[PDB]
Write a protein that binds this DNA or RNA. Structure first.
Ligand SMILES: [Mg+2]
Ligand SMILES: [Mg+2]
Ligand SMILES: [Mg+2]
Ligand SMILES: [Mg+2]
Ligand SMILES: [Mg+2]
Ligand SMILES: [Mg+2]
Ligand SMILES: [Mg+2]
Ligand SMILES: [Mg+2]
Ligand SMILES: [Mg+2]
Ligand SMILES: [Mg+2]
Ligand SMILES: [Mg+2]
Ligand SMILES: [Mg+2]
Ligand SMILES: [Mg+2]
Ligand SMILES: [Mg+2]
Ligand SMILES: [Mg+2]
Ligand SMILES: [Mg+2]
Ligand SMILES: [Mg+2]
Ligand SMILES: [Mg+2]
Ligand SMILES: [Mg+2]
Ligand SMILES: [Mg+2]
Ligand SMILES: [Mg+2]
Ligand SMILES: [Mg+2]
Ligand SMILES: [Mg+2]
Lengths: 83, 153, 128, 115, 101, 100, 211
RNA sequence: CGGCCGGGAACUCAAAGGAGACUGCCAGUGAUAAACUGGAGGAAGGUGGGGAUGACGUCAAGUCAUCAUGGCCCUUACGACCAGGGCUACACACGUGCUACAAUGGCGCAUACAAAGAGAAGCGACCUCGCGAGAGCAAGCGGACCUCAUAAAGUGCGUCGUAGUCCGGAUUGGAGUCUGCAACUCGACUCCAUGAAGUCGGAAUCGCUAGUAAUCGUGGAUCAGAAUGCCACGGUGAAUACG
C-alpha cells in the first residue's frame, strides 16, 4: 500500500485522456498501458482498454472500483485447467 | 573404530552429590545442552524420592538402578548366512548406562504432569519393581532366555 | 600488602584474581558470588580450588572477569584462583595438578567450514 | 457467563475466556477488562452480575460475532462481484496474497487430489 | 603547543613497522617526546567467492585484506620537529593521516 | 555481457548524474511534511516526467571488465571470476588467501 | 585434480605483489580499473619488447610504473623518446602524473613469463611444439634453474583431438610454500585455435622468508 | 560514586618480535631395531586442535551464457531501441530447508553473561510524536572514540494443569508504515480480527567421535527495498564406540 502522505499514484497520459474525455463527453475506450494507476472518481463511467501484456482489455469502471488499480481488472495469465 | 583402543572420556562428579553415576544420569536426562534445567529436575526428584521411599537420595537412586540393571542382552550375529539373535553378558558400565537410559525414557513416557514428579514416581516404582523400566528389563531377559539356544555361536 | 595475582582464561573469558590474606569474602565485579553466579554449579566450581587446598576462610579475593558466558567465566575464575594460589604458596602445585586445575582448557570452538551447515554437520544426502 | 449471545467458559480467567467471543482476541480482551475495571487474573466465575453487565456493555462497542461474520462475508462477496484479481482468486480457491502455487498451497487447495 | 597525532595504515605490517620506526627516530632525534608506536587492532576484511565457472557451489575461494594500524603521538612539538617530519617522505603504500589539535 | 547491455549501463549513469538535483529537490517537496496538495501533487507528477534512467535504482552493478550482472563485489568493482584471476596474479594489493 | 595458483598461494610468504599501494574503499575499485587499463596498454605496446612484469606503485598523488623487461634498449629506444611517449599516454590513462622505471632482467631464460611468451611465439610461427618446449627446458637447466616444468595443451599440430604434453627436469616442489616457484602462462592463437602454455621454474628455496 | 579525573603503566587487551613440544627424559614390550604402552615434568604429549595446501591420471564429466577462441550461421535481422507482460502459472511428482505438534513448555514481570563484523548518495544516537512498523529534529563518526546494538537460551517470581489447550501458527478480512518513477500481476514490515493441518510421522533413509552432535541467539556479502538460503561469530553443551 502506498503511504498516505504521498497519495495515490496515476499516470499523466491517462489523466489528460480522462479529463479530456470527461470534457469531451465521448465514449470511446481509452487505450492505456498504465496498469499501476489507481482509479479516481472522475474516471467513473468510462471504458478503459487496459493492457494485459498481450492485448487491451476494456474495463467499464464503476464507483466500487475507486481506489483500486487498473491492472487488477486486466488479468495477465490465462489458465483454464490441467485436465 | 577399526583401529583405535582409547577408552572412555573422564567425566566430572556431580557438584551437589559428588557422584559420577549421578552426573551421568544428569547428562542422559539433559536435552539440547540445557544442563541447568535437567539438574534442577533431578535434584528435586531425588529429594522427593528420598523423603518418600527412604533415607538418602543416593541410596534410593542406587536401589532403583539395581532393580533396573540388566544381566544379559541380545545382539544379532551373522555367521551361518542368516542372522542369529545371540545373548551376551553386558559389562558393568553398560549395565549402569542401560539402566539409567531405560529409567529416563520410561519417565518421559509417563502421563504425569511435571518431569520431576514423573522421575520421582518412576524411580520409586522401579525400586518397588512394578515400573515400566523393570518391565523392559524383564522383557529383554525373557527374550534372551527364549533364544538362549544360540548361546554358543 | 602482597595482592597475589592470577590470570585465568576460558574459551572467551578472562578473569583477574587478587588474593589477600583475610577472611572468606569473594567479590566478583563489585558483586557477591551468589549475586553474580545464579548457577549453583558455577558457585561450586569457583569454590573448588579453595576447598581442595583448604584456604576458604583464610583468603579475600577480588575478581574481575570479562567475556564469555556463565560457565566460561566460572572456569576462568577457577583457573585464575589456582594460578594465584600457586604463585602465593608454590607448594600446592602438586595438589592442584592432581586435582586438574592447573591445566588451561584450550577447547574454544570449531569454525564453520564452507560446504557444511555447521563445523561438522553436513547437509543431508540423497541417493536418488 | 453469557455475553453477546454465546456461552463463555467460567473456570478460565477473564482475559482468556473473553477471547472465546468471535471478534475479541488478546489485546481487545485486555482493553475491555481495563475499561471495565476488572482484573485479568480473576476468573469468570465468582464475578458479580453488575460487572458482567459492564462487560456486555463494553463488548457492545465492538462488532463481534454474527455481525462481524456478515461484514467479512460482504467484503469477500464484494470482491467477487467486482471481478478484480483478488475476487477471481477467491472464487477459484487459490492463495490470494501472492504465495507460490507450484507447491505449498494446501491450506487453500485442501488435501491432495491424485490424478 | 598542541600535540600532533599520526595514524599509519598499511596492508603490510613489516613495511608499516619500518615506516613508524623512521617517524619515531626523526621526532625523537629532534627533541620532541614520542608517545608510541601504539599498535591498534587490525581490520581483517574477508571475502568468499565461487571459483567454479558454471555450477559448483561448494567449490569456493575465501580471500581477505588485512589492514594494520599504528598510532604515533608527538607531544610538546618543536618547530624543527614539525618541519623535519614534513620533510621526511615515507615508503609508498603507507597511508599517513596527521591529525593535530 | 553484450556490448549493448554495457552501453545501456553507461546511459543510466549519465542520466542519473544529469538529473540528480531536480530529483532530490522534487523528492524533498514530495516528502516534506509542510507542503500542499497543489505542491506535492505537482512535484509528484513532475518526478514521473523526468528521463527514467535518471533514477539510481534502475542501475545495476556489473564487472568493470566483462559486464557480468551477477556476483559483483563492490570493493573490487569486479565479479567473482576476475577477482580470483587478479588475486592469483598478485594485482589486488593486500589480497591473500585466508586460512584462519 | 585441480591445482592452486603457485604465485597466489605464495603471496606474502615468498612472492611480492605486483600492485603495491594502499587505498580506502572509496577509491579501491577505481584504482583497480586504472591499473587494469595501464597494464593492458603497456603489454599491447611492448609486445615485441619482451616485458616480464609490470609493477604499479601509487604515491597519494602519483602513479609509478616499473616495467621489468629483458631488453631495455628497445623499450627506451633513442634517448628518452619512447619512454616519454609511454609516460604521457599512461599519465592520461591514469589521470595522474606518471613516472616510469625500467628494470633489466639479466636472465630471460629463467623468467617464466618470458619463456612462455617465447614458446607461444614459436607455436604461432608453426614450429614443432616438442622442439620448442625441449629447447626451453634445456636452456633453463643450462642457465642453472633448480627445476623447470613446461606444459602445452590443446590441438597440438592442428590435431582434431586435443592433448596435453608436459616435460619436467630437476625438481619443482609445488607443495613447499617456502620454495621460489616462478609460474606464468600464455596462449598461442594458432590457426587451429588456442594452445595454452604453462611454465613452472623452481629457482630455489628462501630460508629467511623475507616476505 | 560513571575510570569519571588527577594520576598509574601493575593487570586485561591491543599487535610486533621471540621462547616452548623434539617420544627430548624414565620404565616396560620388541629383532639388541623401528616403533608401541604407560608417567614424570609441563599451559600444551605423542600430527596438541583447526585451516590452507588436492600427485600421475579417470569420467570425450561441467562450462562456446564470464571470458578468450577454430570452424559454421544471421546482417533493413539471429542485430537496434521502446511500453506491457512473463521468468512468481498449478491437476500433480521429487529434493533441500524452516516452524510446529507442547509442561525439559507457553505467557507475564524482574534480571545477568558474548564474540565477530559493517558504516559517507552510509551507520545514525539523544529528545518529541505514534499501540507498532515508523516519522520529525538532530549530536557524533572514515571510527579500540560515534552508530548499528537491547544478545538469546539462562536465573528468580507468578500463571496456565494435559485440552487440539493461554500448544501451533497457516489462511483470510480490515487498517497502515517504509523503500522505490511505480508495490495490480509481484515487496518487506506493523496493528486489529481469524485461528488450517498438526498429538512425534510406514517401507526406507541422512548427519555426527568433543567444545563435536543438539540447542540459542548475533553479524556480514549480495542489496534503493526485498533471506527460513549462503558465508562467519560466539552462549549452553551431551550420548556412544564391545568389535
Ligand atoms: Mg597430566
Ligand atoms: Mg552454530
Ligand atoms: Mg562477443
Ligand atoms: Mg581445487
Ligand atoms: Mg573511585
Ligand atoms: Mg600423558
Ligand atoms: Mg601437505
Ligand atoms: Mg571433454
Ligand atoms: Mg560429451
Ligand atoms: Mg556431471
Ligand atoms: Mg521488452
Ligand atoms: Mg525459472
Ligand atoms: Mg511469488
Ligand atoms: Mg510455563
Ligand atoms: Mg568497518
Ligand atoms: Mg507511539
Ligand atoms: Mg498460537
Ligand atoms: Mg490477525
Ligand atoms: Mg483432520
Ligand atoms: Mg494436541
Ligand atoms: Mg537487498
Ligand atoms: Mg547489506
Ligand atoms: Mg539458522
Amino acid at each position: 500500500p502506498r503511504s498516505l502522505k504521498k497519495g495515490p499514484f496515476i499516470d499523466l497520459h491517462l489523466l489528460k485522456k480522462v479529463e479530456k474525455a470527461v470534457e469531451s463527453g465521448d465514449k470511446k475506450p481509452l487505450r492505456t498501458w498504465s496498469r499501476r494507476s489507481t482509479i479516481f472518481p472522475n474516471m467513473i463511467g468510462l471504458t478503459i482498454a487496459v493492457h494485459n501484456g498481450r492485448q487491451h482489455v476494456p474495463v467499464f469502471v464503476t464507483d466500487e472500483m475507486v481506489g483500486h488499480k487498473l491492472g487488477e481488472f486486466a488479468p495477465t495469465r490465462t489458465y483454464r485447467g490441467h485436465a | 573404530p577399526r583401529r583405535r583402543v582409547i577408552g572412555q572420556r573422564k567425566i566430572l562428579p556431580d557438584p551437589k552429590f559428588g557422584s559420577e553415576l549421578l552426573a551421568k544420569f544428569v547428562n542422559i536426562l539433559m536435552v539440547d545442552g540445557k544442563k541447568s534445567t535437567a539438574e534442577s529436575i533431578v535434584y528435586s526428584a531425588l529429594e522427593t524420592l528420598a523423603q518418600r521411599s527412604g533415607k538418602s537420595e543416593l541410596e534410593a537412586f542406587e536401589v532403583a538402578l539395581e532393580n533396573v540393571r540388566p544381566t544379559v542382552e541380545v545382539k544379532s550375529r551373522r555367521v551361518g548366512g542368516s542372522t542369529y539373535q545371540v545373548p551376551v553378558e553386558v559389562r558393568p558400565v553398560r549395565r549402569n548406562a542401560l539402566a539409567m537410559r531405560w529409567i529416563v525414557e520410561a519417565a518421559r513416557k509417563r502421563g504425569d504432569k511435571s518431569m520431576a514428579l514423573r522421575l520421582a514416581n518412576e524411580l520409586s516404582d522401579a525400586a518397588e519393581n512394578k515400573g515400566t523400566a523393570v518391565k523392559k528389563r524383564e522383557d529383554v531377559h525373557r527374550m534372551a532366555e527364549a533364544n538362549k539356544a544360540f548361546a554358543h555361536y | 600488602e602482597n595482592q597475589y595475582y592470577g590470570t585465568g582464561r576460558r574459551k572467551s573469558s578472562a578473569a583477574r584474581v587478587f588474593i589477600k590474606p583475610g577472611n572468606g569474602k569473594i567479590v566478583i565485579n563489585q558483586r557477591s558470588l551468589e549475586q553474580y553466579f545464579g548457577r549453583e554449579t558455577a558457585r561450586m566450581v569457583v569454590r573448588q580450588p579453595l576447598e581442595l587446598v583448604d584456604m576458604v576462610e583464610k583468603l579475600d579475593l577480588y575478581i574481575t572477569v570479562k567475556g564469555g558466558g556463565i560457565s566460561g567465566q566460572a572456569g576462568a575464575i577457577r583457573h585464575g584462583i589456582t594460578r594465584a594460589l600457586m604463585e602465593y604458596d608454590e607448594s600446592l602445585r602438586s595438589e592442584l595438578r592432581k586435582a586438574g586445575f592447573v591445566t588451561r582448557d584450550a577447547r574454544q570452538v570449531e569454525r564453520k567450514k564452507v560446504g557444511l551447515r555447521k563445523a561438522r554437520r553436513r547437509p543431508q544426502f540423497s541417493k536418488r | 457467563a453469557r455475553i453477546a449471545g454465546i456461552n463463555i467458559p467460567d473456570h478460565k480467567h477473564a482475559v482468556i475466556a473473553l477471547t472465546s467471543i468471535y471478534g475479541v482476541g488478546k489485546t481487545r480482551s485486555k482493553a475491555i477488562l481495563a475499561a471495565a475495571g476488572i482484573a485479568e487474573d480473576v476468573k469468570i466465575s465468582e464475578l458479580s452480575e453488575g460487572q458482567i453487565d459492564t462487560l456486555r456493555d463494553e463488548v457492545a462497542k465492538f462488532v463481534v460475532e454474527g455481525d462481524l461474520r456478515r461484514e467479512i462475508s460482504m467484503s469477500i462477496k464484494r470482491l467477487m462481484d467486482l471481478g478484480c484479481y483478488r475476487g477471481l482468486r477467491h472464487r477459484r480457491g487459490l492463495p490470494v496474497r501472492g504465495q507460490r502455487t507450484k507447491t505449498n498451497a494446501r491450506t487453500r487447495k485442501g488435501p491432495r487430489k491424485p490424478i | 603547543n598542541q600535540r600532533i597525532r599520526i595514524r599509519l595504515k598499511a596492508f603490510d605490517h613489516r613495511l608499516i613497522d619500518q615506516a613508524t620506526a623512521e617517524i619515531v627516530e626523526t621526532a625523537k632525534r629532534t627533541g620532541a617526546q614520542v608517545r608510541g608506536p601504539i599498535p591498534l587492532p587490525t581490520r581483517k576484511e574477508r571475502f568468499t567467492v565461487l571459483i567454479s565457472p558454471h555450477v559448483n557451489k561448494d567449490a569456493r575461494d575465501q580471500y581477505e585484506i588485512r589492514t594494520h594500524l599504528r598510532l604515533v603521538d608527538i607531544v610538546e612539538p618543536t618547530e624543527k620537529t614539525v618541519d623535519a617530519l614534513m620533510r621526511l617522505d615515507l615508503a609508498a603504500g603507507v597511508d599517513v593521516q596527521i591529525s593535530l589539535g | 555481457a553484450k556490448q549493448s547491455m554495457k552501453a545501456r549501463e553507461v546511459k543510466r549513469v549519465a542520466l542519473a548524474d544529469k538529473y540528480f538535483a531536480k530529483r532530490a529537490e522534487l523528492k524533498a517537496i514530495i516528502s516534506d511534511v509542510n507542503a500542499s496538495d497543489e505542491d506535492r501533487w505537482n512535484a509528484v507528477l513532475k518526478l514521473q516526467t523526468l528521463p527514467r534512467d535518471s533514477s539510481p535504482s534502475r542501475q545495476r552493478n556489473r564487472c568493470r571488465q566483462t559486464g557480468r550482472p551477477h556476483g559483483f563485489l563492490r570493493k573490487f568493482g569486479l565479479s567473482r571470476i576476475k577477482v580470483r584471476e587478479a588475486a592469483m596474479r598478485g594485482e589486488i594489493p593486500g589480497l591473500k588467501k585466508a586460512s584462519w | 585434480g585441480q591445482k592452486v595458483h603457485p604465485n597466489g598461494i605464495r603471496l606474502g610468504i615468498v612472492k611480492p605483489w605486483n600492485s603495491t599501494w594502499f587505498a580506502n574503499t572509496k577509491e579501491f575499485a577505481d584504482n583497480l580499473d586504472s591499473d587494469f587499463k595501464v597494464r593492458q596498454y603497456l603489454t599491447k605496446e611492448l609486445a615485441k619488447a619482451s616485458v616480464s612484469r609490470i609493477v604499479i606503485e601509487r604515491p597519494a598523488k602519483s602513479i609509478r610504473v616499473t616495467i621489468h623487461t629483458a631488453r631495455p634498449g628497445i623499450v627506451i629506444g633513442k634517448k628518452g623518446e619512447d619512454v616519454e611517449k609511454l609516460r604521457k599516454v599512461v599519465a592520461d590513462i591514469a589521470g595522474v602524473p606518471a613516472q616510469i622505471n625500467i628494470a633489466e632482467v639479466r636472465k630471460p631464460e629463467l623468467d617464466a613469463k618470458l619463456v612462455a611468451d617465447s614458446i607461444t611465439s614459436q607455436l604461432e610461427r608453426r614450429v614443432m611444439f616438442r622442439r620448442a618446449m625441449k629447447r626451453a627446458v634445456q636452456n633453463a637447466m643450462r642457465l642453472g634453474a633448480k627445476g623447470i616444468k613446461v606444459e602445452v595443451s590443446g590441438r597440438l599440430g592442428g590435431a582434431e583431438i586435443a592433448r596435453t604434453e608436459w616435460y619436467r627436469e630437476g625438481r619443482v616442489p609445488l607443495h613447499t610454500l617456502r620454495a621460489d616457484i616462478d609460474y606464468n602462462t600464455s596462449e598461442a592463437h594458432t590457426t587451429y585455435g588456442v594452445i595454452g602454455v604453462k611454465v613452472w621454474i623452481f629457482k630455489g628455496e628462501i630460508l629467511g622468508g623475507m616476505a
